[PDB]
Design an enzyme around this catalytic site. Structure first.
Site, mmCIF file in Angstrom:
data_model
loop_
_atom_site.group_PDB
_atom_site.id
_atom_site.type_symbol
_atom_site.label_atom_id
_atom_site.label_comp_id
_atom_site.label_asym_id
_atom_site.label_seq_id
_atom_site.Cartn_x
_atom_site.Cartn_y
_atom_site.Cartn_z
ATOM 1 N N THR B 170 21.745 -5.269 -30.869
ATOM 2 C CA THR B 170 21.428 -4.509 -29.667
ATOM 3 C C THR B 170 22.658 -3.752 -29.168
ATOM 4 O O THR B 170 23.803 -4.114 -29.448
ATOM 5 C CB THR B 170 20.911 -5.431 -28.562
ATOM 6 O OG1 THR B 170 20.526 -4.647 -27.426
ATOM 7 C CG2 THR B 170 21.990 -6.418 -28.140
ATOM 8 N N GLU B 317 17.689 -10.105 -26.192
ATOM 9 C CA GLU B 317 18.442 -11.345 -26.256
ATOM 10 C C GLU B 317 17.559 -12.562 -26.029
ATOM 11 O O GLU B 317 18.053 -13.692 -26.094
ATOM 12 C CB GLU B 317 19.576 -11.347 -25.223
ATOM 13 C CG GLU B 317 20.851 -10.642 -25.658
ATOM 14 C CD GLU B 317 20.864 -9.175 -25.287
ATOM 15 O OE1 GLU B 317 19.818 -8.663 -24.843
ATOM 16 O OE2 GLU B 317 21.921 -8.530 -25.439
ATOM 17 N N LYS B 427 25.874 -0.940 -4.067
ATOM 18 C CA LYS B 427 26.365 -1.965 -3.180
ATOM 19 C C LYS B 427 26.913 -1.385 -1.880
ATOM 20 O O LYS B 427 28.003 -1.754 -1.446
ATOM 21 C CB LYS B 427 27.340 -2.879 -3.884
ATOM 22 C CG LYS B 427 26.712 -3.592 -5.070
ATOM 23 C CD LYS B 427 27.704 -3.799 -6.202
ATOM 24 C CE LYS B 427 26.996 -4.026 -7.528
ATOM 25 N NZ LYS B 427 26.598 -2.743 -8.165
ATOM 26 N N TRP B 432 22.678 -4.539 -1.051
ATOM 27 C CA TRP B 432 22.442 -4.174 -2.446
ATOM 28 C C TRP B 432 21.198 -3.292 -2.496
ATOM 29 O O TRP B 432 20.071 -3.789 -2.414
ATOM 30 C CB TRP B 432 22.282 -5.413 -3.320
ATOM 31 C CG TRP B 432 23.582 -6.016 -3.753
ATOM 32 C CD1 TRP B 432 24.695 -6.202 -2.986
ATOM 33 C CD2 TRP B 432 23.907 -6.507 -5.059
ATOM 34 N NE1 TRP B 432 25.691 -6.783 -3.732
ATOM 35 C CE2 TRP B 432 25.233 -6.979 -5.008
ATOM 36 C CE3 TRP B 432 23.205 -6.594 -6.264
ATOM 37 C CZ2 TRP B 432 25.872 -7.530 -6.117
ATOM 38 C CZ3 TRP B 432 23.840 -7.141 -7.364
ATOM 39 C CH2 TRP B 432 25.161 -7.603 -7.283
HETATM 40 C C1 LIG Z 1 -0.773 -13.543 -27.955
HETATM 41 C C2 LIG Z 1 -0.501 -12.665 -29.168
HETATM 42 C C3 LIG Z 1 -0.100 -11.262 -28.734
HETATM 43 C C4 LIG Z 1 1.302 -11.271 -28.142
HETATM 44 C C5 LIG Z 1 1.597 -9.982 -27.388
HETATM 45 C C6 LIG Z 1 3.103 -9.793 -27.274
HETATM 46 C C7 LIG Z 1 3.488 -9.115 -25.968
HETATM 47 C C8 LIG Z 1 4.814 -8.380 -26.118
HETATM 48 C C9 LIG Z 1 5.122 -7.635 -24.843
HETATM 49 C C10 LIG Z 1 6.394 -6.917 -24.701
HETATM 50 C C11 LIG Z 1 7.703 -7.638 -24.903
HETATM 51 C C12 LIG Z 1 8.835 -6.670 -24.595
HETATM 52 C C13 LIG Z 1 9.558 -6.258 -25.868
HETATM 53 C C14 LIG Z 1 10.708 -5.310 -25.561
HETATM 54 C C15 LIG Z 1 12.023 -5.876 -26.077
HETATM 55 C C16 LIG Z 1 13.205 -5.062 -25.568
HETATM 56 C C17 LIG Z 1 13.212 -3.675 -26.198
HETATM 57 C C18 LIG Z 1 14.465 -3.515 -27.026
HETATM 58 O O1 LIG Z 1 14.487 -2.724 -27.994
HETATM 59 O O2 LIG Z 1 15.452 -4.075 -26.251
HETATM 60 P P1 LIG Z 1 16.593 -3.464 -25.472
HETATM 61 O O3 LIG Z 1 16.940 -2.053 -25.887
HETATM 62 O O4 LIG Z 1 17.787 -4.368 -25.287
HETATM 63 O O5 LIG Z 1 16.012 -3.295 -23.999
HETATM 64 C C19 LIG Z 1 15.841 -4.419 -23.149
HETATM 65 C C20 LIG Z 1 15.800 -4.013 -21.698
HETATM 66 O O6 LIG Z 1 14.630 -3.197 -21.450
HETATM 67 C C21 LIG Z 1 14.188 -3.384 -20.123
HETATM 68 N N1 LIG Z 1 12.768 -3.784 -20.152
HETATM 69 C C22 LIG Z 1 12.108 -4.277 -21.217
HETATM 70 N N2 LIG Z 1 10.811 -4.543 -20.911
HETATM 71 C C23 LIG Z 1 10.626 -4.210 -19.622
HETATM 72 C C24 LIG Z 1 11.917 -3.710 -19.126
HETATM 73 N N3 LIG Z 1 12.006 -3.306 -17.835
HETATM 74 C C25 LIG Z 1 10.939 -3.359 -17.021
HETATM 75 N N4 LIG Z 1 9.728 -3.804 -17.406
HETATM 76 C C26 LIG Z 1 9.495 -4.238 -18.664
HETATM 77 N N5 LIG Z 1 8.271 -4.683 -19.036
HETATM 78 C C27 LIG Z 1 15.071 -4.455 -19.477
HETATM 79 O O7 LIG Z 1 16.087 -3.805 -18.728
HETATM 80 C C28 LIG Z 1 15.663 -5.150 -20.699
HETATM 81 O O8 LIG Z 1 16.890 -5.810 -20.440
HETATM 82 MG MG MG Z 2 18.995 -5.966 -24.460
#
Ligand SMILES: [C][C][C][C][C][C][C][C]/[C]=[C]\[C][C][C][C][C][C][C]C(=O)O=P([O])([O])O[C][C]1O[C](N2[C]=NC3=C2N=[C]N=C3[N])[C]([O])[C]1[O]
Ligand code: MG
Ligand SMILES: CCCCCCCC/C=C\CCCCCCCC(=O)OP(=O)(O)OC[C@H]1O[C@@H](n2cnc3c(N)ncnc32)[C@H](O)[C@@H]1O
Ligand SMILES: CCCCCCCC/C=C\CCCCCCCC(=O)OP(=O)(O)OC[C@H]1O[C@@H](n2cnc3c(N)ncnc32)[C@H](O)[C@@H]1O
Ligand code: MG
Ligand code: MG
Lengths: 528, 528, 528
Positions: B170, B317, B427, B432
Site C-alpha cells: 500500500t 491494513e 485543528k 477539530w
Molecule cells: C459475504 C460474502 C460477500 C462479502 C462482501 C465483501 C464486502 C467488501 C466491502 C468493501 C471493503 C473495502 C475494500 C477497500 C480496501 C481499501 C482500498 C485499497 O485499495 O486501500 P487503500 O488505498 O489503502 O485505501 C484505504 C482507505 O480508503 C478509505 N476508505 C475505504 N473504504 C471506505 C473508505 N472511506 C470511507 N468509506 C468507505 N467505505 C479509508 O480512508 C481507508 O483508510
Molecule cells: Mg491503506
C-alpha cells in the site's frame, strides 16, 4: 500477550457478534423473560460470583439442569473465566455419574432441585467438591441469590486460545465413560465455519438473523449441537422450554413463533402425533433431525405438514457436526418421495472437513456409492484424545485420522449414507454385511414389535446372524414363518441371499441401555 | 506435523469448500470458459510448473495483469506451495513499482503483455529476478504453454498456519510505499468470518450459493476485498471481465446474469450513465460500493434502478473489510431517501471486530453519534507491522491497537460514519474541524468544478483553512462571492460559523496523485 | 560484563592511545584551534548533549557536513554512546539521499547550512527524524550552543564489541544504494593492523608520531580511509580544510607544515597545476592516492616535485584498505620511471589479508603476473552482508569469500595490478578482454577528449566492443582514421589483434554518474 496476536476466545463470540440487539429477548418458558443487555449483565455477575467462590483458571465447574437461561449463562461465564465446564449427562445411572464426577474432579456443582434424589445416592462417595448450588424455578433459587449480590462489571481475562473449555464424558462401548474435551479455538471455529455453511444456503434449511431459536436437545450432550453459540452470535431470539413436554413445546412454538429448532426422531414423532398439533401451522419451522437415523416415513409425514426437515451428523467426538443435508434448488422440485429420501440421508460434509471412506487397512475406498466402509475425518474441532486415556486415544486417532465407528458409502455427488456400525457388522464369510437392513426387513412384519440382529460365531461362514424379535399383543407367529418371511425378499449377495442361518428367536424383552438404545453387547453375553 | 493439530491453510479453502460443483463454470470474458475440475487441474499444473522453476517455500512471485482466471489461479497455487504472492499496483509510477519490486525481492515476475512498456523503463535497474513470464490473451501465452507441459497431479504441503502468503505494498503518506502482509490463518479467518456475517442476513445484501460473482475491483489492491476466496469457497460461478470497459461490463452482466459484484463509485457512475444501461434490467444486482465514500446522490440514483447498493469499509491494513452496511427488515420500508442515507454510511462492524473511537490520548470517546474521533480496531486479520519498518510499525500499533487514520463518530445503534482523515483535520483554535463538509458546501456551487481545502497555519486560531477551487467552462466568479456563498449556510460552531478566514483562492488545476486522488500534501508545499 | 574479558571498543582508541599530548592541536582551517584536552572535553559534552536528546544505544544519528572538528567529534561521541553513525554522501542526488535516510531510519540529523537547499527538496517526504541540527562556521552554530550547555564529565558505557557503529550506504550498480556496516571490533582491528604495517616501513611511506595529518577525502565515503582514527590514536596534529579549495589547501599545507595526507587523482592534479604551487616546497609530503587508478604520468609529475606518492586500494565494503604500495630500499634507487610504475600499482596486501585471484568457478588462478582474474579477499574488517538485503548479500559472499568485482593479476613477488571491472569485461569469443587498455590507446590520440568502450553483443565472437569518443575543440577526425589508429599498435591476441570490430562512434557527450564517473550502464541502454 501481544495485542497484534489475536486469540480466538469465546468472549469474542459474545462481545463481538455478527449482530447485537440490546432489546432482543431471552425467554425461559413461562418463567422468565429478559433482554440481551440483561443477559450480558448476568454473565458478568456470574463471573463475579464464581470469582468470589475461589474458582480459578484451572478449576472445573459441573452443571446439572434442563434447558434454561442458566445453562446459556454457564455456557459463557465459566469458559470466559478460564475454568472448564463439565456437562453431566443426567440420563446416566448414578454410578456412572459418580464415576464421571470423580474422573473430572469437579469443584463446584450446579444441580437442579429435581436431580437432588440422584445426588442422594452419590453424595456420600463424592470427594473434591466444595460447594453445591441448588437451582430452582421459584424465587428461592441459590443461583439467583448469588447473582443478586454481585456487580454487573467485570474485565474478562486473555489467555491462550488452546485452553480447555468444556468436557461432557460420552459413553460408547468401553466399559467406562470416556472424557472428551474442546478448547476455545475449536468452539469458535466450529460456530464460525458452520454459520458460514448453513447460513449461505440459497432458500432451504438456512439459519439467519431473523429466526427464533429453540433447542429440543438435552443441551448437555454435545453443546446442544453448538447451536446456542450460533444463535447468540447472530443476536437472535432464544426460547428455552425446560422439561420437554410436548404440549408446552407446541404452545411455545405457537406463541413465540419459533422458526428454527433441532430435535431427535422420538420427540418429533411425539409432537407430530400429539392432538394439539392437528390445528397448528407448521409452515415456518426448520427442525434439524440429527440425533440418529431420521426415518424416511417420519420425514415424509413431517413434510406433509410443510416442515423444513433435514438431517445432520455428529458423534460427540467431532464438534459434533460433520455433515448436513443441503438441497439444491433443482432438488426442491421433487414431490414428496425423492425429497424424503434426500432429506433423510447423512448429508454432505461441511466446510473444512475431509471425510474419506476407508477399510480395515486404511486404503481409501472409492466413492462409487455402493462400496461401504468406515468414515474417517479431519476437522478443526476434533478431540485430540480421550481424557486420561492412552490406548483408547491411540485407537481413536489410528493412521493419522479420527476413527468414527460408522460404516457408510459415499456416492458420486458427495451424499453420505450411513449403513451400520463397525462393531455391528456381520463379517459373514469374508464379506461385511450390515445388521440394519435385516432389522428393517423383519420390523416390517405385521406381528413384530422390535427386532435385534446379533452375529452368532460359526466355524465357517465367519460369523452368522442371529435374530431376536419381540411380538405384539395377542400375536404368536412361529419361527419358521419369520425365517420364510425374510426369504421372500430378493437382491442379496453371498450364499443365495444370506437366508440360510437367520436363526430367529423369540425373546419376551430385549435389553436396552440407560438411554433407550438396544444394548447389543449385553445381548451377546446372554445368548452366547 | 501432528495430524490432530489442525492448521488453517488456504488449500483447505479450495479442497474443503462449503460447496463444490465440478461442472460449475469459470468464465474469462469472451476469451475462455472452463469448469471447477479444470480449475483444480490447472492449479495443480501451475504448482508443478512453479516447482520446476526452482520456486521454494521462502520465495516470492510477483504478478502483473488484469482480472482473469490466471489471477485466480495465482491466488491459490503460489500460497499453497508456500511462496509469497506479491500483487503489484500497476497504477503506480514506474519508479514506485521498481521500489516495490526491489523491496520485496521478487524471484519470478508474471506480467501481462500490455504492461511490457512499463517494464521497459524499469528492467535495467531490476535485480533478484530470474524469470519473466509474459501473459497474453491469445494462444501464444507463456503461462498457458508452461501449464501444458505439466501433469495435473500434485501433493500440497503442510506447513504452519502463520506462514506469510500475500504482500501488496500500500501507498499512503510516507514518502515510500509500505509493505503489508498476511498469513494463511488470517485469510482463512477473514473469508470464514465474513461469510458468517454477510451470508446470514435475512433478505438484503447477502451472498449465497446461488449467486454469480464478478469483480469490478483491480484485484491487486486488497485481494479484491477477499471476495474471490469467498466465491470459490461457495463453489459459485465467477466471471472476470478483464480491462473494465463499461460496455463489455454491461454486456457481461446481461449475458452471464451476474447477481453479485463490488465496485468503486467512479465505475458505478460510468455504468449508470452509459447509454446501454437505459434498457437493461438491474433488479438482480448486489453491488458493494466500498471503495471510498459512496455519495448519497449516486446511491439514490442507483436505487431507482432497483439495485441492492450498500457500502463497506476497508483500509488495506485490515483484511481489508472491517464494517459493512446491513439493513434490518424494518429499515427496508423506507422509501428512497432514508434508505439512501443508511446505505451510504460506513456501516456496522463485522464479526470479531472491536472498533472503538478514541482521541489523541486514547481515551475511548463515547458513542453518542456527535463526538468525532479516530477509529481504532482489533481483528483476527490485521497486519502486525509494516515490512522492514520499525518506527512506522510502532506508530501503526500505538497503544495496543491498530491506528486507522480515519476520523468518525459512532452512534447509539452502532452505525459508523466517517467524517475526515486524521491529517486533514483543521485543528482550528482547540477544536477539530473536518475539511470534507467545507468541500461539499463549496462543491455545490453552480460555477464550481472541484474544491480542495487546506489548513493554512496561523499564530492564533491554531491553523485556519484555505480553499482551492477550479471553475467550470466560461465561469468567472469572484473570491468575495465564494466567501459570501459559504457564509450563507448555518449550524456551525466556534467563531460565528467558521466563516472569517476561509481564504478561498482560484487555481487553474489541482494536483492529484497517480491514482486520481487530490494530493493535499503537495498542495501544502505549493501554497505554504 | 566480566572485567577480565576485554572488549575492543572505539573508546579505547581515544582513552588508551599510542601517544597522548594534551597540548597537541586540532585545527579547523582559519576558523578554530583547540587542544586534545579540549577535544576530549567536547566529546564528553557532545555525549551529554546526545543523551539529553533521548538518543539511546540502538538509535541512529546522521551527519551532513564537510571535514571539520565536528565530524571528528561525531566519529567518536556517537559510537561511544552505542548509537550508529550514518555518513550521508552529499554528492548523491536528493532522491538517493532521501532513499538512504528512509532506509537507515535516522533519528537525529546534523546538517551543514550549505546543504540546507537539498533538504528543502526532501524534508517533506522524510519520516522518523525528530530533530535537525544546523551546523555553521560562525557563532550561531546550533552544535556549539548545544555543547555549551553540557558538562565535560561523562562515564562511557561498556558493551559488546560486535555492536554496529557506522553505516554509509555505498552506491555501485544495483539500482538502489546498498547499506554497509561495521562494528567497534572491526574498526579497532582496522586501525591497529594498518598502523602495524604502514608504520613499520623502513624509510618510505610511513606515518609516525611526528607527522601532521590533513584529509583531502570527503570523510563520509569510507571513514576517510580510516585515517582520522589512526591520527588520533597517534596523538598527532590534525588540520581540517573544509570545502577543498586548492588555494586554501596549499596555504594550509605551507603554514601548518602538513606532512601526511591522502587524496584522489583529480584534486592532486589540481594542486600540482595551481600557480601557487610553483614556488612551494613539497619535499615533506606523503600523499596517498588510493581513490581510483593513480595515473603513471601524474605520479611521475608529482615525483619531480619531491612528493612521496604511493597508491592504496579500497572498496567501501572492505574496511576499506586492502593493499598499499610499499617500496623496499632496493626499489628506492630507481630514477624516475620504474619508481613511477611501482608507485602507481595497486600494491601488496596489508597484514591479515588473504587476497587470492579466482575465476568464475572459484579455481584460484596462479600468481604468474599474466593471468587475470577477480580479486577475492578475507579480512577482519569486512561487511558480513548488505543491510536489509538477502540475495545481493549472498552474491557478495559467494563461495565463502568476499567478492570485490575487480579483475587483476598478481605477480610473483606479490604486486597487484588491477586491470578492469568484472562487468566491464569484453567477453569476446571465449576470452576476457579488458576495456581499460582500449580506452587508454584511444585516449592518446591528439584529437580525442574522452573515450568509453562498451561491449556490443554479437551472434558469434561472444560480444564485441563498441567505442564512444568525444572530440576536442575544432577537431573533426573520421571514424575510419580512429579505427586505423588503433590498428597501428601491436601485441594483442585473439583474431589478429582484436581490431576487426572496434566500431568507434562519435558522441557529442558521454553520460556520467552524479560523482563524475562514466556511467557505462546507461551507455548500454542508449546504444543497445
Ligand atoms: C459475504 C460474502 C460477500 C462479502 C462482501 C465483501 C464486502 C467488501 C466491502 C468493501 C471493503 C473495502 C475494500 C477497500 C480496501 C481499501 C482500498 C485499497 O485499495 O486501500 P487503500 O488505498 O489503502 O485505501 C484505504 C482507505 O480508503 C478509505 N476508505 C475505504 N473504504 C471506505 C473508505 N472511506 C470511507 N468509506 C468507505 N467505505 C479509508 O480512508 C481507508 O483508510
Ligand atoms: Mg491503506
Ligand atoms: C447454520 C446455523 C444452524 C446450524 C444447525 C446445526 C445442525 C446440527 C445437526 C446435528 C448434529 C448432530 C448432533 C448429534 C451429536 C451426537 C449425539 C450425542 O449425544 O452423541 P453420541 O456419542 O451419544 O452419539 C453419536 C453417534 O450417533 C450416531 N449418529 C449421530 N447423528 C447421526 C445421523 N444423522 N445419522 C446416523 N447416525 C447418527 C452415530 O453413530 C454417532 O457416532
Ligand atoms: C599507517 C597509517 C597511515 C594509513 C594510510 C592509509 C592508506 C589508505 C589508502 C587508500 C585506501 C582506499 C580508500 C578508497 C575507498 C573506496 C572509495 C569509496 O568511496 O568507495 P567506492 O565503493 O565508491 O569505490 C570503490 C572502488 O574504487 C576502485 N578503487 C579504489 N581504490 C583503487 C585503487 N587504488 N586502484 C584501482 N581502483 C581502485 C575499485 O573499483 C573499488 O571497488
Ligand atoms: Mg460418540
Ligand atoms: Mg564499493
Amino acid at each position: 500477550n501481544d495485542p497484534s496476536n489475536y486469540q480466538l476466545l469465546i468472549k469474542n463470540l459474545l462481545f463481538s457478534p455478527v449482530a447485537f440487539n440490546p432489546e432482543q429477548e431471552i425467554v425461559y418458558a413461562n418463567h422468565r423473560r429478559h433482554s440481551y443487555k440483561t443477559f450480558h449483565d448476568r454473565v458478568r455477575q456470574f463471573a463475579n460470583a464464581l470469582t468470589k467462590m475461589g474458582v480459578k483458571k484451572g478449576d472445573t465447574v459441573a452443571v446439572m439442569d434442563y434447558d434454561s437461561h442458566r445453562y446459556l449463562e454457564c455456557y459463557f461465564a465459566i469458559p470466559m473465566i478460564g475454568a472448564k465446564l463439565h456437562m453431566i449427562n443426567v440420563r446416566l445411572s448414578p454410578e456412572q455419574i459418580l464415576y464421571t464426577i470423580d474422573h473430572a474432579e469437579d469443584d463446584i456443582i450446579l444441580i437442579h432441585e429435581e436431580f437432588l434424589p440422584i445426588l442422594d445416592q452419590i453424595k456420600g462417595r463424592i470427594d473434591t467438591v466444595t460447594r453445591y448450588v441448588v437451582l430452582r424455578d421459584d424465587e428461592e433459587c441459590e443461583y439467583e441469590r448469588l447473582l443478586e449480590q454481585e456487580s454487573t462489571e467485570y474485565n474478562f481475562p486473555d489467555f491462550d486460545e488452546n485452553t480447555v473449555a468444556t468436557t461432557f464424558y460420552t459413553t460408547g462401548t468401553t466399559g467406562f465413560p470416556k472424557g472428551v474435551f474442546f478448547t476455545h479455538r475449536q468452539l469458535v471455529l466450529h460456530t464460525m465455519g458452520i454459520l458460514s455453511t448453513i447460513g449461505t444456503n440459497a432458500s432451504q434449511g438456512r439459519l439467519h438473523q431473523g429466526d427464533i431459536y429453540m433447542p429440543i436437545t438435552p443441551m448437555f450432550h454435545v453443546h446442544a449441537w453448538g447451536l446456542p453459540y450460533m444463535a447468540t452470535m447472530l443476536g437472535v431470539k432464544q426460547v428455552y422450554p425446560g422439561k420437554y413436554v410436548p404440549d408446552v413445546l407446541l404452545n411455545l412454538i405457537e406463541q413465540e413463533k419459533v422458526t428454527f429448532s433441532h430435535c431427535v426422531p422420538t420427540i418429533l414423532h411425539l409432537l407430530l402425533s400429539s392432538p394439539k398439533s392437528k390445528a397448528m401451522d407448521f409452515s415456518g419451522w426448520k427442525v434439524v433431525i440429527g440425533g440418529a437415523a431420521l426415518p424416511k416415513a417420519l420425514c415424509k409425514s413431517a413434510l406433509e405438514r410443510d416442515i423444513d426437515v433435514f438431517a445432520g451428523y455428529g458423534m460427540s467426538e467431532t464438534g459434533p457436526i460433520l455433515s448436513i443435508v443441503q438441497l439444491t434448488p433443482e432438488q426442491l422440485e421433487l414431490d414428496v418421495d425423492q425429497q424424503a429420501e434426500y432429506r433423510s440421508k447423512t448429508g454432505k460434509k461441511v466446510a473444512l472437513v475431509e471425510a474419506y471412506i476407508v477399510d480395515e487397512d486404511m486404503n481409501k475406498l472409492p466413492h462409487d456409492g455402493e462400496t461401504a466402509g468406515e468414515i474417517v475425518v479431519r476437522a478443526p474441532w476434533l478431540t485430540p484424545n480421550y481424557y486420561k486415556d492412552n490406548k483408547n486415544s491411540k485407537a481413536l486417532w489410528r493412521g493419522g485420522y479420527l476413527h468414527t465407528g460408522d460404516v457408510a458409502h459415499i456416492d458420486d455427488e458427495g451424499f453420505i449414507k450411513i449403513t451400520d456400525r463397525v462393531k455391528d457388522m456381520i463379517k459373514i464369510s469374508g464379506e461385511w454385511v450390515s445388521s440394519l437392513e435385516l432389522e428393517d426387513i423383519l420390523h416390517q412384519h405385521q406381528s413384530v414389535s422390535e427386532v435385534a440382529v446379533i452375529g452368532m460365531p460359526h466355524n465357517k461362514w465367519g460369523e452368522v446372524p442371529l435374530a431376536l424379535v419381540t411380538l405384539k399383543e395377542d400375536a404368536q407367529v412361529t419361527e419358521k414363518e419369520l425365517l420364510g418371511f425374510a426369504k421372500d425378499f430378493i437382491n442379496k449377495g453371498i450364499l443365495a441371499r444370506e437366508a440360510l442361518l437367520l436363526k430367529v428367536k423369540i425373546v419376551d424383552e430385549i435389553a436396552k441401555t440407560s438411554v433407550g438404545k438396544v444394548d447389543k453387547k449385553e445381548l451377546r453375553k446372554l445368548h452366547l
